[PDB]
Design a protein around this ligand. Structure first.
Ligand SMILES: [Cl-]
Ligand SMILES: [Cl-]
Lengths: 124, 124
């Protein structure tokens, strides 16, 4: 007969170092990239792909931008993404974030020559 | 001078490292922990701290449970957790979950002798 204490452990405990570290990814990255300097940027996305692969998106699927612009491009393939969203209890300067992992198509706005990404628009 | 392009790389690129966690963590964990056997549990949280630290919460900030009971306690420090939320497309027996990670104070209900956590109430 499984005890109440053991049941709690089975459904709520996972003492893993890597799991603990991953939970702090956004908190650490938002600070490292100076995104929490004078304020907490509420939302931000990090792409775990090579720069060349992301730059290539500008020569791919031409799509409409969320702000009415037409210089946005969507990736043909899915890419490893990490969504960082500000927590309800977040307080400056200790900006708190929630880490979410996903594989989606990224949409970026491109400008200049070379035609490279200057803004992250969305993921689909 | 930091160009718009450079700023994009600083704000959105993380080519040097893969995702610190999988988006399939919850799907895997809910199954192995037999949390989807009788039904798809709507939501479940996993703590990534040592069992001792979690058990200690039973002797910390006494807070009222969401159900009106007074056998709940809030942790002094924040803990690394993972929230598993059932996806809108999930359907038993094929339970699907969304994985989210953060560092928050936990609230558990304790009872028995020794006084140990028997139910995860909430986070904050
Ligand atoms: Cl902004
Ligand atoms: Cl519970």
């Amino acid at each position: 007969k499984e005890t109440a204490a053991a049941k709690f452990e089975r459904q709520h405990m996972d003492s893993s170092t890597s799991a603990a570290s991953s939970s702090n990814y956004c908190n650490q990255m938002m600070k490292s990239r100076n995104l929490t300097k004078d304020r907490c940027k509420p939302v931000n996305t990090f792409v775990h792909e090579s720069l060349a692969d992301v730059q290539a998106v500008c020569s791919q699927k031409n799509v409409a931008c969320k702000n009415g612009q037409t210089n946005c491009y969507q990736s043909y393939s899915t890419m490893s993404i990490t969504d960082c969203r500000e927590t309800g209890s977040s307080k400056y300067p200790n900006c708190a974030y929630k880490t979410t992992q996903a594989n989606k198509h990224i949409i970026v706005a491109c400008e200049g020559n070379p035609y490279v990404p200057v803004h992250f628009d969305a993921s689909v």
